[PDB]
Chain length 190, copies 4
């Protein structure tokens, strides 16, 4: 069991470019079970494939995008509107009005159960869940997090709590002074 | 596979001690059971040995639960609280009768998640849980799955979707804000 | 294992002389007042008077509430004893308690030194505090409300005023952490057994 | 029964063969070098990130004294950020790597043989007076800051300046320890039973 608050100031950047927040482990863009990242998309163009993986993307900032997946055009995607597609698909991204930054979850579906939900913390919100892995990404600054009643720290914009190997039902409570959007990503192995 | 359970069809069973009564919404020696209860008197809770419980007040002044000697903070509407069915538990009503919402489940058979959500216009999430119980506390919640409308819920109705496979995209909409409780269960294995 | 004892459940036994009463919090085992290895309790002392003996035992007493007391031990008068000032004396000593100004309540550890090693310390929990220890038995008494306890990073409960955590049979080095919103005094009692 | 007040001015200093830091040993029960002792207390200057040598068969407890802090990776598991006076225990048999979070730091270390010693370690903030009763046969009281006076069984035994340390061994029975200080001062009380 482990719990850490990952700081945006520590995220590495790789090649468009992507900032990886976390991964379960493994090497390269072919060796992980799951990976969470923030990407910068400055031009319309194709998305590289992640064969065998399931993808869920959300724009964070910018005018949005429209994704053509295997010839089929998605609806206009705006901030925090999660969209799921297969890494096996041929995807072209059309930027609606300029560069955007997005939030991406990529995972192997035959080995990891997943849940992804954007939530707006207004004062306080909470939930109970048995997920072994929780990634809680704060889009806006100022989200404090407690687990089983114990305060665990505060998140600044783009920081992300990462908890792994949790066992049993967990009670998570988020608090904030001003409305703050966060994305809760939960994963379970096999 | 996918049904919308209607409150008019829920059975009601009074408690042996006359302190309340329970309306069972759904159940899978059960693996899990979801119910609504009227609690009119303070008193102890019958045990559900080996089960995990999560209780939430739906209306009324609230309650305070004493679990194996530990007194909870005051519990008001939609403040979920978890405790073991093996624990000794006494419920003290804070200010009169209340109605609650309860999940009881076998932890060694099902993984579980429970969250109160206020649908303001629309909200959505993607999830892989095999079973979703979406309870509407208020009227007017429409639910779509994978972009396909699946119906609407009136106050206290509950969507029950079982045996779901793969990532699901759930969207809830309401013309006027409405509180719902999303309970997700999966058969671990 | 680990249990939090609640003050509302402590039994109360009036002293046969009517000068007070005792509420036993816990004991390792054994019967009566001469058969235990260690015993923790809270006593009410309503009048000045002699203290009954606990032959062969080491005692550590602390005032909890009230103006305080002065103990005359084998003829030597102690300095005035006020809240949370632990004082050790032998159960073999002749002891007279003089109440300074009215009734008091005290916290008492009585133990057999040939069977148990002991440590006792009043700690004021201001936000957070932690320590590592190998003691097999930990009794953590909260004088004031609001202390949350975690062991090895895991929350284990919360104590209201006069509640007491009792952990026995602990093996190896333990990491204990206490947290409180409003400052709260606690008394950490650690015991280890001969052998 | 012996009681000594060790002065920081008299501590030895051993530079690490790898050049990443140095260790100033405060006290030890016995032996020579990095083994043979039942216990050892020391302060260290950690100038750079890097692995920690092992101390096979020993239990370790480390606390940062000055600096931003560090994260310790123990057998692959990265600890939370460790800041001043936050003690952290780990095995001397473990593989450990230290990552400095913001520059060089000074730390305080306890290493002891678990098969032969019971141990307790607690950072205490002395403001005015504080006392406790204990039966430990050995007490090491390290003062991080100046101004702490110590009494045992009612008898004043000395005063500690920053980084000085009281070492008491062979103690018998229940002891009444009392620390007093005017301006707040952190001390770390280490108790070892034979």
């Amino acid at each position: 069991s482990e719990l850490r608050i990952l700081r945006a100031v520590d995220y590495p950047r790789m090649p468009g470019s992507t900032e990886e927040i976390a991964r379960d482990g493994g090497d390269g863009l072919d060796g992980f079970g799951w990976r969470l990242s923030i990407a910068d998309v400055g031009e319309s163009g194709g998305f590289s494939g992640f064969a065998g993986y399931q993808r869920i993307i959300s724009v964070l900032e910018g005018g949005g995008m429209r994704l053509r997946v295997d010839g089929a055009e998605s609806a206009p995607l705006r901030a925090r509107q999660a969209f799921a597609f297969s890494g096996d698909s041929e995807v072209h991204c059309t930027l609606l009005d300029g560069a955007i930054r997005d939030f991406n979850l990529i995972y192997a579906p035959r080995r990891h159960r997943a849940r992804l939900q954007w939530l707006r913390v207004e004062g306080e919100l909470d939930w109970h869940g048995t997920a072994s892995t929780l990634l809680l990404f704060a889009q806006q600054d100022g989200v404090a997090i407690s687990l089983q009643g114990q305060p665990r720290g505060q998140l600044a914009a783009h920081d992300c709590l990462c908890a792994e190997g949790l066992q049993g039902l967990q009670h998570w409570r988020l608090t904030a002074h001003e409305p703050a959007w966060v994305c809760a990503v939960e994963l379970d192995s096999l």
